[PDB]
């Protein structure tokens, strides 16, 4: 698809068998999801935004479907205002910015 | 252009007569630039994300050249670690997400 930006670019994702809404975010290096249970071990990560840095949990090689496209990669879990799909998974689904 | 997301989608902008680098950020509702002076009136605003909220100055009807495309809109000025071009101006240059 071609998604315009008059509205937030919200899509449905599937992670852990569960449907969630998430924001396609070209300003995000990484994918960050609200608190949830994921399998496997996690490692520590700090991520930063306009208001400062926060601690999150990094899970690698997580299966997630984004707007119908399968990705397998790193998912961070922590206190994010909205679920965010960042560039690490946008590249996997083949997304580009065009103008 | 068509911009891939292997790297941060940074472009050159012109604002207040100054050339700067900025991030094309589909996750941002608003455009936020590092501290600089801009002409006219402004009002205070709080904007937030991961890490919390920060106070910024809101300037309306500001013109910006974004990678060669002129646009006009609201620009927020404040302590952001990266200049961000948000959806309010990405729409004006006809930017879309494609996959």
């Amino acid at each position: 698809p071609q998604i315009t930006l008059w509205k937030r670019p919200l899509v449905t994702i599937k992670i852990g068998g569960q449907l969630k809404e998430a924001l396609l975010d070209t300003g995000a290096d990484d994918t960050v999801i609200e608190e949830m249970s994921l399998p496997g071990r996690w490692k520590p990560k700090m991520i930063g935004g306009i208001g400062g840095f926060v601690k999150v949990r990094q899970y690698d090689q997580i299966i997630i479907e984004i707007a119908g496209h399968k990705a397998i990669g790193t998912v961070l879990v922590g206190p994010t205002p909205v679920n965010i799909i960042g560039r690490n998974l946008l590249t996997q689904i083949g997304a580009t910015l065009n103008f | 252009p068509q911009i891939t997301l292997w790297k941060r989608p940074l472009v050159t902008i012109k604002i207040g007569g100054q050339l700067k680098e900025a991030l094309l950020d589909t996750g941002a509702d608003d455009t936020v630039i590092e501290e600089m002076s801009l002409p006219g009136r402004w009002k205070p605003k709080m904007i937030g994300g991961i890490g919390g909220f920060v106070k910024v100055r809101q300037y309306d009807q500001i013109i910006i050249e974004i990678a060669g495309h002129k646009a006009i809109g609201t620009v927020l000025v404040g302590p952001t670690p990266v200049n961000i071009i948000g959806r309010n101006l990405l729409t004006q240059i006809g930017a879309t997400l494609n996959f």
Binding site: D30, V82, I84 | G48, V82, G86
Partner: peptide
């Protein structure tokens, strides 16, 4: 809202 590094 605005949106990480």
């Amino acid at each position: 809202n605005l949106x990480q590094i």
